[PDB]
Amino acid sequence: PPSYLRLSEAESKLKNNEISVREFVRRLGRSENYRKRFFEPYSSPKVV
Amino acid sequence: SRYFKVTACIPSLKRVRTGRELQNTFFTKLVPYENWFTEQQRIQKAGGKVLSVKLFTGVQGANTGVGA
Amino acid sequence: SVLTKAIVNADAEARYLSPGELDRIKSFVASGERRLRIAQTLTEARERIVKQAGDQLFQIRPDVVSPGGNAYGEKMTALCLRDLDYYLRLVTYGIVAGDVTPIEEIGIIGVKEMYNSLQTPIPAVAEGVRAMKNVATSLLSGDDAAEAGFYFDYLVGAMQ
Amino acid sequence: MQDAITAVINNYDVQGKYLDGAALDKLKAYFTTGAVRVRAAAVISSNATTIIKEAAAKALIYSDLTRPGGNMYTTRRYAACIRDMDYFLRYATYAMLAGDPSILDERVLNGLKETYNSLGVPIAATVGGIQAMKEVVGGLVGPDAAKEASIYFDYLSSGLS
Amino acid sequence: MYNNVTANTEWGRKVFKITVAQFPDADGLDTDNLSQSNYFVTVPLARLLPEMQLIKNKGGKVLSVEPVVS
Amino acid sequence: MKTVITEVIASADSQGRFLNNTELQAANGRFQRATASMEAARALTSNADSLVKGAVQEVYNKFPYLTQPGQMGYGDTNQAKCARDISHYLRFITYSLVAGGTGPLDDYIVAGLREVNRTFNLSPSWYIEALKHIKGKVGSQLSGQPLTEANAYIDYCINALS
Amino acid sequence: MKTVITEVIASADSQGRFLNNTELQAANGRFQRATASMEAARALTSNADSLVKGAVQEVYNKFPYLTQPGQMGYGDTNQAKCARDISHYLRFITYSLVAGGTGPLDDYIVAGLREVNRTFNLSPSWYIEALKHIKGKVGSQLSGQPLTEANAYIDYCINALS
Amino acid sequence: MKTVITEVIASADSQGRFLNNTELQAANGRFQRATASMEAARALTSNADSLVKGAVQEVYNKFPYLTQPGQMGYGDTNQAKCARDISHYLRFITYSLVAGGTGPLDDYIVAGLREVNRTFNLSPSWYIEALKHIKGKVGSQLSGQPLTEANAYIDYCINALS
Amino acid sequence: RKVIDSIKIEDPVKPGDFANFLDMARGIESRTGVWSISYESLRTLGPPEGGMLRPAVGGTAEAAAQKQLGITAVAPASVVELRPNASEEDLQGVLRAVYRQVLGNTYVMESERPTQAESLLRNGSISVREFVRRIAKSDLYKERFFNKASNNRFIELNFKHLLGRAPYNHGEIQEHFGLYHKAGYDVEIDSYIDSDEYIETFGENIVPYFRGFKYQTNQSAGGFPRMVKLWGGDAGSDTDRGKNGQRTLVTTKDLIGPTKIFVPFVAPGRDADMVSGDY
Amino acid sequence: MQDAFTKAIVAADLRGSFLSEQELNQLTNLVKESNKRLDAVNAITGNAAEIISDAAHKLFAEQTDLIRPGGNAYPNRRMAACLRDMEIILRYVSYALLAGDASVLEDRCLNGLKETYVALGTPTRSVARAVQLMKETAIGYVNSPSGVTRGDCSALVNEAATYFDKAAASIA
Ligand SMILES: CCC1=C(C)/C(=C/C2=NC(=C\c3[nH]c(/C=C4\NC(=O)[C@H](C)[C@H]4CC)c(C)c3CCC(=O)O)/C(CCC(=O)O)=C2C)NC1=O
Numbered sequence A: 001p002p003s004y005l006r007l008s009e010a011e012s013k014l015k016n017n018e019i020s021v022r023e024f025v026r027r028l029g030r031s032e033n034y035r036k037r038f039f040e041p042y043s044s045p046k047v048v
Numbered sequence B: 001s002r003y004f005k006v007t008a009c010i011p012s013l014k015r016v017r018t019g020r021e022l023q024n025t026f027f028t029k030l031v032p033y034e035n036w037f038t039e040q041q042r043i044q045k046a047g048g049k050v051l052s053v054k055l056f057t058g059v060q061g062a063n064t065g066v067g068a
Numbered sequence C: 001s002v003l004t005k006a007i008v009n010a011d012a013e014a015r016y017l018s019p020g021e022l023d024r025i026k027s028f029v030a031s032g033e034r035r036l037r038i039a040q041t042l043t044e045a046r047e048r049i050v051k052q053a054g055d056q057l058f059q060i061r062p063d064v065v066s067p068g069g070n071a072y073g074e075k076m077t078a079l080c081l082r083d084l085d086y087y088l089r090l091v092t093y094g095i096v097a098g099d100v101t102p103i104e105e106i107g108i109i110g111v112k113e114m115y116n117s118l119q120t121p122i123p124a125v126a127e128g129v130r131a132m133k134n135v136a137t138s139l140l141s142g143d144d145a146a147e148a149g150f151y152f153d154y155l156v157g158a159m160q
Numbered sequence D: 001m002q003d004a005i006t007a008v009i010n011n012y013d014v015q016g017k018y019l020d021g022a023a024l025d026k027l028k029a030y031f032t033t034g035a036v037r038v039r040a041a042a043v044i045s046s047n048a049t050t051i052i053k054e055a056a057a058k059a060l061i062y063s064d065l066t067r068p069g070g071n072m073y074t075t076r077r078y079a080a081c082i083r084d085m086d087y088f089l090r091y092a093t094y095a096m097l098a099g100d101p102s103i104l105d106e107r108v109l110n111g112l113k114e115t116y117n118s119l120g121v122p123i124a125a126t127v128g129g130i131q132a133m134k135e136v137v138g139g140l141v142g143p144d145a146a147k148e149a150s151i152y153f154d155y156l157s158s159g160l161s
Numbered sequence E: 001m002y003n004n005v006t007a008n009t010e011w012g013r014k015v016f017k018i019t020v021a022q023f024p025d026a027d028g029l030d031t032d033n034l035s036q037s038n039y040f041v042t043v044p045l046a047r048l049l050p051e052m053q054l055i056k057n058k059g060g061k062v063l064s065v066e067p068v069v070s
Numbered sequence F, G, H: 001m002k003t004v005i006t007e008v009i010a011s012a013d014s015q016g017r018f019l020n021n022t023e024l025q026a027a028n029g030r031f032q033r034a035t036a037s038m039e040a041a042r043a044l045t046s047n048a049d050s051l052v053k054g055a056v057q058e059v060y061n062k063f064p065y066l067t068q069p070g071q072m073g074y075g076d077t078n079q080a081k082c083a084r085d086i087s088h089y090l091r092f093i094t095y096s097l098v099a100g101g102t103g104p105l106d107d108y109i110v111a112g113l114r115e116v117n118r119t120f121n122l123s124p125s126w127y128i129e130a131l132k133h134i135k136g137k138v139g140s141q142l143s144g145q146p147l148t149e150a151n152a153y154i155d156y157c158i159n160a161l162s
Numbered sequence I: 001r002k003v004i005d006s007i008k009i010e011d012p013v014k015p016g017d018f019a020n021f022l023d024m025a026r027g028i029e030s031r032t033g034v035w036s037i038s039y040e041s042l043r044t045l046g047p048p049e050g051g052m053l054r055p056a057v058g059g060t061a062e063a064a065a066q067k068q069l070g071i072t073a074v075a076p077a078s079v080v081e082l083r084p085n086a087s088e089e090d091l092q093g094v095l096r097a098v099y100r101q102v103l104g105n106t107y108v109m110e111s112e113r114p115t116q117a118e119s120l121l122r123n124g125s126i127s128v129r130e131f132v133r134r135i136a137k138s139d140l141y142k143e144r145f146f147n148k149a150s151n152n153r154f155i156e157l158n159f160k161h162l163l164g165r166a167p168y169n170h171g172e173i174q175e176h177f178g179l180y181h182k183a184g185y186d187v188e189i190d191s192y193i194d195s196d197e198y199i200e201t202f203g204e205n206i207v208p209y210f211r212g213f214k215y216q217t218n219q220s221a222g223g224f225p226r227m228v229k230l231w232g233g234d235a236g237s238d239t240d241r242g243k244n245g246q247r248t249l250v251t252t253k254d255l256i257g258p259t260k261i262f263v264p265f266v267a268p269g270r271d272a273d274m275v276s277g278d279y
Numbered sequence J: 001m002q003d004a005f006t007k008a009i010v011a012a013d014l015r016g017s018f019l020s021e022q023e024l025n026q027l028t029n030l031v032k033e034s035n036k037r038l039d040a041v042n043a044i045t046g047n048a049a050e051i052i053s054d055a056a057h058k059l060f061a062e063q064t065d066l067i068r069p070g071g072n073a074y075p076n077r078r079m080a081a082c083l084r085d086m087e088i089i090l091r092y093v094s095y096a097l098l099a100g101d102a103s104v105l106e107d108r109c110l111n112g113l114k115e116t117y118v119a120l121g122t123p124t125r126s127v128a129r130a131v132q133l134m135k136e137t138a139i140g141y142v143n144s145p146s147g148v149t150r151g152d153c154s155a156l157v158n159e160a161a162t163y164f165d166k167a168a169a170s171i172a
């Protein structure tokens, strides 16, 4: 991403081993950057 | 806004996986409070060992400012 | 057991056991004394079952007790029958538990890798267990011999 | 986990022993109590909600615990507490069916003491919630099953203290 | 002299001298470092009965008691 | 010297305490049991020597090389000192029987046993075999609680030597 | 908890030693003595109710002034806590009888007695007089070795309080 | 593990002290002595096979009866475990030679020796006789200070067993 | 001519006169084959003969469990003792071992040295036991191990310094603190030194050494891992100058183990108001 | 320390009660069987050395790895420690048997023992086995002794077994 959405503090949390890759992925799933771009425009069935 | 900071050891006991896996089984991870009840059950239903837990983030008091 | 397998389903859905789950525990436990008799008979004839299994095996495939064979020699043979004694034991465990949980963790998960490493023909080995079933099936009266036979055929099934 | 039938097998397997007379006697001692365990589980399961309600009423609510400053103040925490209660009841029912407490260690007690210390959850108050559910259970299940159900509630409660 | 500074009470101020001769008890050979069985302890008055009790308890023989402070 | 009486007194003294009902009950055991003990004692006392000559010989019969020349079961002095030694053991067994405890055995034979036997090249095996034999024959001189007592102390010596 | 059995085991353990004939003789005393002890125990057990009311009253009859207002034998709570306390003593006496030693008395009543009584302004004299009375009446409930046992333990409490 | 080096270091440490000329002089002894020690070690090392078979046999030749049935020099397993045991001794002798002290002998054979031998009914006499024989033959494999070293350690084992 | 219940009878066709399974039971015989292999010797099976000097799998090499825990210089501890008519270096070696053991590896500065006791210990007017008692009642011991800790830490530090072993049960601690409250610290220190465990082992001239790592007679088996918790390394000490000055170890949750029954079943449930009728 | 009577007393006291007629007669029965109990304890004491020795011979017969270099009963020092532990456990089992209660065994011997062995690298399964062998032989002796009056000692043989089995379970 052109230095976009990304993960300020998210990157340090994943590296540092404060957070584990599964966890980081879960954070990424529920975020504005994600809601917009994949759930912003779709009935309830293809977004699932 | 409350994050526990658990630590576990889960030992694979159904498959003898063949590559890597060190960090898969002995690891420290803050997991948010909303999900920590399930993560603990999942560690326990795999014969895992929950070595440590902490509050880490939240105050250990409550009512306002907890369930955000 | 049936209990271990089933309760696990209860706890995982955060609930008490179902009428169904309770019923099967009841039917299972009613079939207890018979299963215990099947294990006793076979425990009582273990040495006969193993050796006669071992003869039946080496006829059907001798090469293993020959110059370039994995079981060639007196102490390389003392180990092959010992492995046959191991699996008969696990079969008695399985029969009294009513499923394979114990049989599986103790002697199939990791095996095939285990046998393979040592370079033993896995089908050679399943003959031998299949041969043990025959000797043993014959020291039991017709009803108990079948009940025992299911556990022998399980091991034969798993090793492949 | 392990149960009475399974424990007998793994306890002997590590010694490489056939099941012998002593083993066979233990397994009989389990099978002979089996039908009674099943009936008791069906009573507990079908009265689950009433047992929690009566146990909370005798040992938790109408108190400082449910008042501001108390750990089961807020609908959130009241819900979490009786949720916990249901776990205990449900797992004790598993332990009693299995005739082995090992599941109570593997899936309930491990780390729970410190989890409760970390959140501030009152341990002594939780034990009373366990021993009140036992009291109710022992009435509902009858002479046949009372002692056998009771022990796994007692296992749970000395596991926290 | 003795052990020196004692307890501050007057009943701690009086130290006495005991010459003993400990005997081999029974039951066992001592192969460790042994000492010649005579010796002497200076004990304050406040302590004295435990010390004489454990001296005569281990087969000992109290040979002399002396008033060294008082 | 260890007896029921000395033991309870030792335990009282060490807590600075008068004898109480616990300690007097104990003493009654020792006194109630004197009759059986002392019957064993009288029987072992009058039927005595031959036990020594029997056991001495058996040491040579079980270790033949013993009674051969250059060996430690040869010549009057070895064979004399052997009889004497078994006699010492039987003597202390009777004392332990009469005393109500192992004291006489502990103080006069057990304390120091191995050091002595090791310096003098005396094998415990002989002494165990002397005692095993004495135990065989005492089977028909006594019975009931006198035999149990005799056995208790013979076995105590055999364990001291193993 | 001090019994003949625990005492001999303690003494063995502390010398790193198996139980020997000395220690088993001791144990036989405790077992031989159980019959008399346990007869005393059963008699003291069923008469407890009245033994307690008898001794409680006797404390007031010997110390008349206790029952006047402003005093410690006045009002339901003092008189209630008194009955209870004598009942505690009789209870531990029966336990000591059954146990074969003073342990129950030592651990539950003697350890700490004076400190407690001194903080709470409880005179031992009352308790001695309660026990002296209990001793008078137990003269006709028992006889022979059961009485001697009952006496042993009652007297043990009286000495603990002097 | 006791060597000249460890001993002087232990003595320094326990006084909280740097190694001084006293301790370094000591170390020079151990280093100067290594040549003779290590020659003994090499000779004992390559002859091990036969030194062991020689001593094993000599145990049977000196105690003929051991090789009869029902005895402890009979059957493959006893005779196998014997060779092994003498081999253990020679092994630790070479180690003690190489190490510059008795440490290896003290830690691996002496500590516990008698308890083990006593539980397993192993007579030291055999082992002394194995070692006396090994000492006889090592008279012609070595000479001068290598022989003195070999002797020092063989004799050390014989004294450990007496 | 007797009972019905011989009804256990096999029902096959019995063998004919030369079947291959009449001489079957004699066919298992006296050769070197699959029927020659002794059955009960299957468990104790080895390599291709691997004879007797193959090392064990997972070798350990004696004094490595000591090396793993780092208790090498301490298990077993060397015995230091004042011989009669000792020289100066002997007395300095004894004094150093006393200051290492009794003061728990904490350091004394040159101003803190109890000098005028040593002029006497060099005289021989006191023994090593009396000198240990005099140190343990002085302010060097009192400031470090008593003045900033609770009674549990102080009582367990007395066992480590004076007796060299760990507390055995809760009864050892509940006996000693009762003596402390009844009779003060001076009788309390004397209770360890006048005990039977001191007089039997250390006598009158032997500096106290570590005994909690080997077996001692009349020990509880919790006494070893408690001593491992108390040990804290060779370069460790019982100093207070850290961030937690003498927090407790071997907590009375160690000394009494499992619990069984009770929680106080209290009622913060509420009761009151009264109206009457209609039901 | 508890014995079987002391145990009764502690449970009674926790009720605030004089001993129940139930508990009284259970203890009257223990006194009834006490001569047999003394013979049973005496059987072990009188053969302690052989019980340990025979257990030992058999343990190393089965597990020849322990007596190889690398093994936990090698060299002499370790074998002596192992022989010593066998004695210690047999000793506390005999104490429990005189007492009619396992507590001395659990409190003075078994408490912490497993964690000690793991710290040391001592194979607990081998130690458990050595305990199983001591049990076989010890009971052998309890059942077949020198001129004891003939009767039934199975109740006591069971109870002794549970003490051996407690120790085994606790350690493995
Ligand atoms: C949202 C709140 C939050 C904070 C504040 C945060 C800090 C933080 N700083 C980090 C590293 C770092 N922080 C610095 C900071 C500095 N270097 C200097 O010399 C200066 C003194 C200072 C800047 C003024 C540096 C250089 C690293 C990299 C260390 C490395 O190379 O691993 C890391 C490790 C992961 C990573 O490298 O990103 C974290 C998590 N993380 C968070 O989640």
Ligand SMILES: CCC1=C(C)/C(=C/C2=NC(=C\c3[nH]c(/C=C4\NC(=O)[C@H](C)[C@H]4CC)c(C)c3CCC(=O)O)/C(CCC(=O)O)=C2C)NC1=O
Pocket (backbone or CB within 6 Å): B010, B011, B012, B013, B016, B017, B019, B020, B021, B022, B023, B025
């Ligand atoms: C990529 C680097 C890496 C390594 C090295 C690694 C080791 C490793 N070994 C494991 C288990 C294990 N490791 C062993 C090993 C042995 N058993 C013995 O007795 C022998 C002494 C030894 C073989 C020589 C065994 C038996 C287990 C299973 C333990 C269990 O049953 O849970 C586990 C637990 C998860 C699993 O069971 O797979 C890990 C992660 N993991 C990694 O990611």
Ligand SMILES: CCC1=C(C)/C(=C/C2=NC(=C\c3[nH]c(/C=C4\NC(=O)[C@H](C)[C@H]4CC)c(C)c3CCC(=O)O)/C(CCC(=O)O)=C2C)NC1=O
Pocket (backbone or CB within 6 Å): D060, D061, D062, D063, D066, D072, D073, D074, D075, D078
């Ligand atoms: C601030 C967040 C919060 C709330 C709201 C709360 C409610 C609450 N309501 C309760 C009982 C109750 N609440 C009611 C209420 C009603 N009965 C009816 O039929 C009506 C529908 C309703 C009145 C409008 C009744 C009747 C009980 C008694 C129920 C019982 O005792 O079984 C109790 C148990 C008694 C106690 O221990 O206090 C709690 C904790 N607790 C909290 O922490």
Ligand SMILES: CCC1=C(C)/C(=C/C2=NC(=C\c3[nH]c(/C=C4\NC(=O)[C@H](C)[C@H]4CC)c(C)c3CCC(=O)O)/C(CCC(=O)O)=C2C)NC1=O
Pocket (backbone or CB within 6 Å): B033, B036, B037, B038, B040, B041, B062, D060, D065, D070, D071, D072, D077, D078, D080, D081, D082, D084, D085, D087, D088, D107, D108, D115, D119, D121, D122, D123, D125, D126, D129
């Ligand atoms: C499957 C086995 C299992 C158990 C037993 C379990 C317990 C458990 N109880 C929790 C919290 C809690 N537990 C309670 C319990 C109580 N409050 C009281 O005052 C009473 C004394 C008591 C009820 C009787 C409360 C109030 C919380 C919420 C604490 C918070 O606000 O964070 C949490 C934190 C995560 C969450 O809030 O869900 C867990 C994991 N988790 C599990 O996985």
Ligand SMILES: CCC1=C(C)/C(=C/C2=NC(=C\c3[nH]c(/C=C4\NC(=O)[C@H](C)[C@H]4CC)c(C)c3CCC(=O)O)/C(CCC(=O)O)=C2C)NC1=O
Pocket (backbone or CB within 6 Å): E023, E024, E030, E033, E034, E035, E036, E037
């Ligand atoms: C500094 C080095 C040192 C020496 C030299 C020493 C001698 C010494 N020998 C002693 C006893 C003894 N010494 C002997 C020696 C003998 N009995 C005889 O008949 C023979 C003539 C002689 C052997 C040749 C005996 C028998 C006793 C015990 C006396 C008794 O307790 O009755 C004792 C009394 C303490 C004890 O019994 O352990 C000491 C201190 N102690 C030491 O620490």
Ligand SMILES: CCC1=C(C)/C(=C/C2=NC(=C\c3[nH]c(/C=C4\NC(=O)[C@H](C)[C@H]4CC)c(C)c3CCC(=O)O)/C(CCC(=O)O)=C2C)NC1=O
Pocket (backbone or CB within 6 Å): F056, F059, F066, F072, F073, F074, F077, F078, F079, F081, F082, F083, F085, F086, F088, F089, F108, F109, F116, F120, F122, F126, F127, F130
């Ligand atoms: C108070 C208790 C007590 C005991 C038990 C005792 C044993 C004892 N046996 C000894 C010698 C001896 N013991 C024997 C024993 C035997 N010779 C044989 O023919 C048989 C093989 C065997 C008898 C079974 C022999 C031959 C000697 C002489 C050893 C010597 O001086 O070379 C000696 C050396 C002093 C001496 O020469 O008399 C002692 C102290 N001493 C005691 O004071």
Ligand SMILES: CCC1=C(C)/C(=C/C2=NC(=C\c3[nH]c(/C=C4\NC(=O)[C@H](C)[C@H]4CC)c(C)c3CCC(=O)O)/C(CCC(=O)O)=C2C)NC1=O
Pocket (backbone or CB within 6 Å): G056, G059, G066, G072, G073, G074, G077, G078, G079, G081, G082, G083, G085, G086, G088, G089, G108, G109, G116, G120, G122, G126, G127, G130
């Ligand atoms: C387990 C064994 C045990 C004993 C023996 C025991 C004695 C005992 N007696 C007490 C009080 C008492 N004891 C009495 C005794 C008496 N009052 C009278 O009318 C008579 C003069 C006399 C009976 C002879 C009284 C009046 C109190 C109340 C003292 C107070 O709190 O002011 C208390 C203080 C706690 C309380 O108030 O209950 C203890 C501990 N406690 C124990 O746990």
Ligand SMILES: CCC1=C(C)/C(=C/C2=NC(=C\c3[nH]c(/C=C4\NC(=O)[C@H](C)[C@H]4CC)c(C)c3CCC(=O)O)/C(CCC(=O)O)=C2C)NC1=O
Pocket (backbone or CB within 6 Å): H056, H059, H066, H072, H073, H074, H077, H078, H079, H081, H082, H083, H085, H086, H088, H089, H108, H109, H116, H120, H122, H126, H127, H130, J057, J060, J067, J073, J074, J075, J076, J079
């Ligand atoms: C590291 C140093 C070390 C030594 C020295 C050692 C000695 C030793 N010898 C033993 C047995 C043995 N030792 C022998 C010795 C002999 N048999 C004969 O034919 C001869 C008479 C004699 C040789 C001179 C015998 C027969 C056994 C078997 C004893 C038994 O188990 O019954 C055992 C018992 C364990 C086992 O059975 O292997 C030990 C520990 N172990 C060690 O670890």
Ligand SMILES: CCC1=C(C)/C(=C/C2=NC(=C\c3[nH]c(/C=C4\NC(=O)[C@H](C)[C@H]4CC)c(C)c3CCC(=O)O)/C(CCC(=O)O)=C2C)NC1=O
Pocket (backbone or CB within 6 Å): E001, E004, I116, I117, I118, I119, I120, I122, I123
């Ligand atoms: C209870 C308090 C107490 C006193 C009073 C005491 C005196 C005392 N002075 C001593 C030595 C000494 N005292 C002196 C004193 C002197 N030399 C001279 O020429 C002068 C005349 C004089 C100084 C004014 C000397 C030189 C020695 C050493 C003697 C030697 O070792 O040769 C010693 C021998 C132990 C040692 O050297 O430390 C004692 C016990 N010790 C005590 O514990």
Ligand SMILES: CCC1=C(C)/C(=C/C2=NC(=C\c3[nH]c(/C=C4\NC(=O)[C@H](C)[C@H]4CC)c(C)c3CCC(=O)O)/C(CCC(=O)O)=C2C)NC1=O
Pocket (backbone or CB within 6 Å): I149, I150, I151, I152, I173, I174, I175, I177, I178
């Ligand atoms: C540093 C100064 C210091 C303190 C403060 C201290 C506390 C302390 N209290 C203890 C016991 C105790 N403390 C109490 C106190 C109470 N019981 C109750 O029910 C009440 C709520 C409370 C009185 C108000 C009791 C009953 C015990 C004995 C517990 C037992 O052994 O079962 C113990 C265990 C050792 C012993 O019993 O002597 C310690 C160390 N020790 C110290 O050295």
Ligand SMILES: CCC1=C(C)/C(=C/C2=NC(=C\c3[nH]c(/C=C4\NC(=O)[C@H](C)[C@H]4CC)c(C)c3CCC(=O)O)/C(CCC(=O)O)=C2C)NC1=O
Pocket (backbone or CB within 6 Å): I105, I106, I107, I108, I234, I235, I236, I237, I239, I241, I242
């Ligand atoms: C086994 C051999 C051994 C070692 C290595 C050892 C280390 C050690 N250093 C200590 C303290 C100390 N160590 C230092 C060292 C330093 N301060 C600094 O700022 C520098 C960075 C550094 C010097 C280079 C200081 C200042 C203390 C005192 C800390 C305090 O009390 O506040 C202490 C606490 C006890 C005491 O103060 O005496 C120990 C045990 N102790 C031992 O027995």
Ligand SMILES: CCC1=C(C)/C(=C/C2=NC(=C\c3[nH]c(/C=C4\NC(=O)[C@H](C)[C@H]4CC)c(C)c3CCC(=O)O)/C(CCC(=O)O)=C2C)NC1=O
Pocket (backbone or CB within 6 Å): I063, I065, I066, I213, I214, I215, I216, I219, I220, I221, I224, J066, J071, J072, J073, J078, J079, J081, J082, J083, J085, J086, J088, J089, J108, J109, J113, J116, J120, J122, J123, J126, J127, J130
């Ligand atoms: C409370 C009573 C009590 C017990 C039970 C006890 C056990 C115990 N066993 C120990 C060692 C030991 N225990 C053994 C035992 C064995 N090795 C094997 O291979 C076999 C499987 C087994 C014999 C059956 C060995 C070999 C050691 C020494 C370990 C080492 O130092 O490497 C140690 C370490 C201290 C020492 O070596 O003396 C303790 C504390 N200590 C006690 O005070």
Ligand SMILES: CCC1=C(C)/C(=C/C2=NC(=C\c3[nH]c(/C=C4\NC(=O)[C@H](C)[C@H]4CC)c(C)c3CCC(=O)O)/C(CCC(=O)O)=C2C)NC1=O
Pocket (backbone or CB within 6 Å): F033, F144, F145, F148, G021, G024, G025, G028, J032, J033, J035, J036, J037, J038, J039, J040, J042, J142, J143, J144, J145, J148, J149, J150, J151, J152, J153, J156
């Ligand atoms: C010195 C301590 C001491 C001991 C040891 C002791 C033993 C003792 N065992 C006895 C009985 C007995 N002992 C046994 C024991 C056994 N029966 C068997 O067949 C088994 C092999 C063995 C099992 C342990 C039996 C069956 C009786 C007879 C029944 C009875 O009196 O209870 C009797 C009653 C008298 C008799 O019938 O001989 C005594 C006094 N008394 C004591 O004061």
